[PDB]
Amino acid sequence: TAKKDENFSEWYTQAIVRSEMIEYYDISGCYIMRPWAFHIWEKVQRFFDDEIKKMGVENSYFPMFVSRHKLEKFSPEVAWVTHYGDSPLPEKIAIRPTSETIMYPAYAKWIRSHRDLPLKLNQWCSVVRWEFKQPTPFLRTREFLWQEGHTAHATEEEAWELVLDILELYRRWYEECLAVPVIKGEKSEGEKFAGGKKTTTVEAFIPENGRGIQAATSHLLGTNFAKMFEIEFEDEEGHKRLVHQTSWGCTTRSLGVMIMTHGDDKGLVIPPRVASVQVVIIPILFKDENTGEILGKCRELKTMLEKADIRVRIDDRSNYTPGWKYNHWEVKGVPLRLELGPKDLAKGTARVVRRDTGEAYQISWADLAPKLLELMEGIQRSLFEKAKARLHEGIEKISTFDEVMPALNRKHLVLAPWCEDPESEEQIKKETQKLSEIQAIEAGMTGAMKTLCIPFDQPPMPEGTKCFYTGKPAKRWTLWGRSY
Amino acid sequence: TAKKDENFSEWYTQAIVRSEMIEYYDISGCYIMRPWAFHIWEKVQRFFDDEIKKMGVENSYFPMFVSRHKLEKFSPEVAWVTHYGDSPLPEKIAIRPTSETIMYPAYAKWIRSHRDLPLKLNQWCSVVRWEFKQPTPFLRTREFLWQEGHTAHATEEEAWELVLDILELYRRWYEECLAVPVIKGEKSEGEKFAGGKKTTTVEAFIPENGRGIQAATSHLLGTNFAKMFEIEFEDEEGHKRLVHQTSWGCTTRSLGVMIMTHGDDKGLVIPPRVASVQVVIIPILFKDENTGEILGKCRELKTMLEKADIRVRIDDRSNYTPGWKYNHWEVKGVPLRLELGPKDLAKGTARVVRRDTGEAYQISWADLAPKLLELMEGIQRSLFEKAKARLHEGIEKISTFDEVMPALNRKHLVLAPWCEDPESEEQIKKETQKLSEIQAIEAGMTGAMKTLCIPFDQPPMPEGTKCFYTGKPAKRWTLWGRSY
Ligand SMILES: Cc1cc(N2CC[C@@](C#N)(C3(C)CC3)C2=O)cc(C(=O)NCc2cc(F)cc(-c3cnn(C)c3)c2)n1
Numbered sequence: 001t002a003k004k005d006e007n008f009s010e011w012y013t014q015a016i017v018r019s020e021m022i023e024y025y026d027i028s029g030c031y032i033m034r035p036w037a038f039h040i041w042e043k044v045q046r047f048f049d050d051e052i053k054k055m056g057v058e059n060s061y062f063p064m065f066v067s068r069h070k071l072e073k074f075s076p077e078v079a080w081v082t083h084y085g086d087s088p089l090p091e092k093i094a095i096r097p098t099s100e101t102i103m104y105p106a107y108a109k110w111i112r113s114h115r116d117l118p119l120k121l122n123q124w125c126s127v128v129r130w131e132f133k134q135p136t137p138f139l140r141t142r143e144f145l146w147q148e149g150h151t152a153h154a155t156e157e158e159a160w161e162l163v164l165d166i167l168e169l170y171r172r173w174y175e176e177c178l179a180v181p182v183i184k185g186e187k188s189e190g191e192k193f194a195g196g197k198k199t200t201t202v203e204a205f206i207p208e209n210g211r212g213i214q215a216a217t218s219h220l221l222g223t224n225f226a227k228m229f230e231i232e233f234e235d236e237e238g239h240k241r242l243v244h245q246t247s248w249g250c251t252t253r254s255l256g257v258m259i260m261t262h263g264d265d266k267g268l269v270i271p272p273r274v275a276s277v278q279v280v281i282i283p284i285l286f287k288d289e290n291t292g293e294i295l296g297k298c299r300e301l302k303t304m305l306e307k308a309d310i311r312v313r314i315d316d317r318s319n320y321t322p323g324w325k326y327n328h329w330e331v332k333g334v335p336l337r338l339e340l341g342p343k344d345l346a347k348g349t350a351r352v353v354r355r356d357t358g359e360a361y362q363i364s365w366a367d368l369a370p371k372l373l374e375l376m377e378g379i380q381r382s383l384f385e386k387a388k389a390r391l392h393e394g395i396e397k398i399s400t401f402d403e404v405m406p407a408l409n410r411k412h413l414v415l416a417p418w419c420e421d422p423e424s425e426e427q428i429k430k431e432t433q434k435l436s437e438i439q440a441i442e443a444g445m446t447g448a449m450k451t452l453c454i455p456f457d458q459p460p461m462p463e464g465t466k467c468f469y470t471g472k473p474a475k476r477w478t479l480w481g482r483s484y
Numbered sequence: 485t486a487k488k489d490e491n492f493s494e495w496y497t498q499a500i501v502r503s504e505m506i507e508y509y510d511i512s513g514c515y516i517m518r519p520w521a522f523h524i525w526e527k528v529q530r531f532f533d534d535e536i537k538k539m540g541v542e543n544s545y546f547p548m549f550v551s552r553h554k555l556e557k558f559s560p561e562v563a564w565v566t567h568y569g570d571s572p573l574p575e576k577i578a579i580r581p582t583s584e585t586i587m588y589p590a591y592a593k594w595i596r597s598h599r600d601l602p603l604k605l606n607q608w609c610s611v612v613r614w615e616f617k618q619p620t621p622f623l624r625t626r627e628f629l630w631q632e633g634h635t636a637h638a639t640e641e642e643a644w645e646l647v648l649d650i651l652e653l654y655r656r657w658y659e660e661c662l663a664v665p666v667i668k669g670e671k672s673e674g675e676k677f678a679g680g681k682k683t684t685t686v687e688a689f690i691p692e693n694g695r696g697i698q699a700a701t702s703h704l705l706g707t708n709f710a711k712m713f714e715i716e717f718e719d720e721e722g723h724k725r726l727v728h729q730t731s732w733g734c735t736t737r738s739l740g741v742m743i744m745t746h747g748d749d750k751g752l753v754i755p756p757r758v759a760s761v762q763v764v765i766i767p768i769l770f771k772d773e774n775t776g777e778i779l780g781k782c783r784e785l786k787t788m789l790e791k792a793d794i795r796v797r798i799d800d801r802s803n804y805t806p807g808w809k810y811n812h813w814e815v816k817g818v819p820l821r822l823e824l825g826p827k828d829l830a831k832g833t834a835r836v837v838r839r840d841t842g843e844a845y846q847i848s849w850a851d852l853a854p855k856l857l858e859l860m861e862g863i864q865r866s867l868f869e870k871a872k873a874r875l876h877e878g879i880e881k882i883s884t885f886d887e888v889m890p891a892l893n894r895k896h897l898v899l900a901p902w903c904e905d906p907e908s909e910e911q912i913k914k915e916t917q918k919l920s921e922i923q924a925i926e927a928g929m930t931g932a933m934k935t936l937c938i939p940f941d942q943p944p945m946p947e948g949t950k951c952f953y954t955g956k957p958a959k960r961w962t963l964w965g966r967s968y
């Protein structure tokens with residue numbers, strides 16, 4: 001009903017509700033994750049889990065509660081448990097917004113010698129961040145599922161290499177699983193995690209509202225938390241030294257980003273590598289046909305495709321028309337549908353329709369498994385490459401501040417030479433907010449532009465390039481935009 | 485240090501701490517699950533997940549918070565969130581002790597027609613039950629990991645068949661994965677879940693303290709929650725009818741039961757089917773030997789065993805002796821260790837020692853993979869059969885109440901003919917508590933005996949057998965004991 005290029009927020013709501021991905025809940029900012037979305041979470045979780053276990057990372061489970069003393073060592077976002085029944089607790093306890101203060105006292109106890117390092121742990125769980133602003137399903141919620149990984153190393157260089165390895169895993173999570181392009185970069189001093197040394201990030205872009213969104217994060221913590229929690233190891237000489245730490249996380253926000261990137265006016269489009277149903281088989285069931293024969297062949301084709309590890313469902317319900325089923329599985333984003341009626345059976349072929357473009361194919365039964373494998377890889381790659389083209393066309397390279405507001409009004413990001421002085425970033429935030437409010441009055445949700453990241457992939461910097469806002473000597477190209 | 489048959493509680497604490505399964509935490513009743521235990525949780529979770537997905541059950545994720553109104557529709561055990569930072573919430577919200585009141589309003593919305601049934605959902609998450617009593621790691625904790633499954637059906641018979649199917653999956657979880665024997669049964673009217681029609685259970689037994697413990701649970705809810713939450717469906721006639729529901733759950737308590745069942749004085753013994761390391765390879769590293777050759781052969785053997793899906797770790801650390809490593813991996817419960825030094829290499833054999841009995845074998849390299857597969861299945865079966873023998877010898881079949889206290893003093897359960905009158909069960913609880921306190925004073929934690937279950941496997945009931953406590957006509961054999 002709602003078109004993606006008109007009212008994007010109602011289009012998004014419709015897409016995720018009518019596909020049965022989410023259900024609303026009476027506590028604002030929390031949503032139920034129904035199986036159609038949860039299956040995709042399980043897929044990207046299995047991918048990430050397999051990859052970090054190759055790195056020596058092991059899973060664990062730390063408590064969801066943290067004592068006041070351990071935590072206070074943001075604060076309006078922490079939900080506090082204060083009573084058990086109607087009786088009060090001696091000291092209130094907080095629900096984890098993140099688990100640094102829960103895990104790191106244990107780390108301090110576990111780590112004694114250089115032979116105890118590196119220590120690499122992860123956990124899958126939910127965290128709670130209690131903001132009063134308007135939530136967005138998947139993207140910004142008061143409770144969300146995530147993983148958080150936390151490691152400790154004998155040297156800064158080894159920790160930093162792990163930070164980059166994890167960030168490459170997040171790039172693969174988005175680009176290789178979800179077909180969403182991202183930009184690797186480092187956060188500005190004002191945007192980085194306060195408790196760390198350097199925050200690396202992958203950033204995505206939502207063309208319809210022009211907003212950048214942080215996709216995942218990998219922090220070089222250095223020795224800051226090691227001094228805070230007294231996490232030290234002994235070298236083989238016997239001298240005690242602080243450990244060098246990392247932490248990293250990624251959330252169900254990734255599902256929302258995937259949904260927004262690939263959806264169209266008919267609803268969801270799910271990349272084949274994460275679709276729980278890759279091929280839906282729809283028999284044509286005329287009253288005047290050998291229905292048993294048609295259903296039998298559908299079952300044979302399902303078996304044949306599953307031997308190729310294709311995930312198949314047959315929708316053989318007699319009480320819905322094929323047109324109804326076409327729309328039903330399009331709305332849910334199944335990437336391929338296979339139609340089989342008496343004429344196809346007589347020709348020994350099946351008709352296959354791809355969800356992204358609607359192109360149709362007639363495929364022999366012998367060619368079905370390899371041709372469908374090839375088509376799923378083509379769909380996955382085309383979804384990614386068109387998203388990547390939209391990303392590149394959503395970024396304007398600029399040289400002075402005069403170009404900021406026009407580009408923002410085109411719902412674009414800007415890539416600008418920046419001197420990286422923190423004071424300049426907050427001046428830029430405040431000025432672009434003011435200019436946005438003026439433009440809003442002339443037109444008849446926040447408008448501020450901030451840094452999204454300083455990209456790893458730096459374009460050439462001609463000698464003597466000036467900062468686009470301060471006029472001081474520029475240091476690096478920086479990606480800015482309105483943001484989630 | 486502590487012997488299992490002397491101070492069982494210190495033996496248990498040592499076993500789980502020195503093996504690095506748990507770490508203590510400053511909030512009483514909560515424990516950290518370290519990787520050595522968490523890997524076992526992941527194994528039984530994968531087993532259960534695979535089995536219920538074959539049944540059509542799909543995973544999901546519902547919020548951890550429930551509003552006061554929805555929940556109140558036990559109470560001292562519910563932890564309440566009342567503030568965000570230092571600011572109060574309009575209405576307090578509770579942390580899930582279980583998710584019936586969170587999921588079932590959604591069910592009422594989702595279910596409209598008989599073609600929407602059955603509805604089968606599960607989730608893996610943690611719940612919180614805030615008791616002030618003394619916790620026991622794994623067995624009784626204020627936060628614990630579990631799965632909870634919740635289904636809805638058009639008829640009571642289909643719901644009841646699902647209840648039994650799930651209970652058979654729990655039997656397999658304990659007996660087939662963990663090698664722990666359990667007794668299927670139905671709970672008494674006084675012990676069953678209040679909101680349901682009938683509670684089925686599998687019960688285990690801890691010989692060292694004589695206590696039964698509920699291992700997992702599967703409830704026939706019938707239509708009670710359907711009326712509470714107005715969950716109704718239409719038949720093809722058009723009449724509205726209440727759904728018939730089930731719920732079922734199982735927790736990390738299962739790990740504790742496994743630990744207590746198979747451990748010995750040296751520490752943990754982990755059944756091969758859930759051990760994250762099934763075989764540890766320990767090279768002998770004399771100073772005066774070709775160490776590179778020995779390590780190379782260890783790597784080749786590891787590859788050969790892993791082709792047979794055996795989970796292998798090589799402990800090639802030069803700075804620990806083989807004796808130290810033997811003890812280290814015994815304490816952690818690895819079921820098989822493989823020793824390889826220059827003499828073994830010259831003979832083309834390896835020495836293999838099984839953890840349960842200490843028996844040693846000399847195995848040719850060609851015979852290693854099939855012989856180790858056979859040995860792991862023998863270890864698994866022997867662990868189960870000896871546990872099952874201890875279970876059978878821990879149960880005394882009795883006919884009158886006079887036999888209760890002697891059997892309880894032998895740290896046994898009793899199987900007795902019972903009339904199943906609820907009033908009699910609470911009289912029995914109170915009387916055995918009083919008798920236990922008297923015995924405690926004569927000797928120089930609760931002592932009450934309650935029903936554990938009415939077993940599915942009923943022994944013969946001679947005509948006119950009387951209830952062992954009331955003297956009324958007996959109805960069924962019932963298993964009683966002290967309990968967790
Ligand atoms: C799912 C999710 C995901 C994320 N993030 C943050 C970065 C990250 C990445 N990459 C992580 C955590 C991995 C590092 C990610 O995924 C943040 C939030 C969130 O901040 N929730 C609270 C909330 C509730 C709410 F009702 C409204 C708002 C709200 C409305 N307007 N504004 C300005 C805030 C905020 N939630």
Ligand SMILES: Cc1cc(N2CC[C@@](C#N)(C3(C)CC3)C2=O)cc(C(=O)NCc2cc(F)cc(-c3cnn(C)c3)c2)n1
Nearest residue numbers: 513613615617619623624625626628698699700733735737
């Ligand atoms: C891990 C776990 C597991 C279980 N159960 C219950 C049945 C079940 C099974 N089968 C489930 C939930 C699956 C159906 C199971 O696993 C119960 C508890 C628990 O009741 N926790 C609260 C608590 C904390 C605490 F510090 C102390 C006590 C305490 C001390 N003495 N007494 C009498 C209580 C209780 N905990």
Ligand SMILES: O=C(C[C@H]1NCCC[C@@H]1O)Cn1cnc2ccccc2c1=O
Nearest residue numbers: 074075077097098148193217247248249
């Ligand atoms: O959570 C992090 C840092 C990293 N922790 C590990 C996983 C990746 C993650 O970005 C930062 N943060 C964010 N939000 C809060 C809200 C309230 C209290 C503390 C915090 C708080 O610390």
Ligand SMILES: O=C(C[C@H]1NCCC[C@@H]1O)Cn1cnc2ccccc2c1=O
Nearest residue numbers: 558559561581582632677701731732733
């Ligand atoms: O949790 C259950 C019933 C089933 N719920 C689904 C998974 C299996 C489980 O036994 C019973 N119970 C147990 N303990 C409480 C404590 C506080 C509030 C409610 C409860 C409460 O309801």
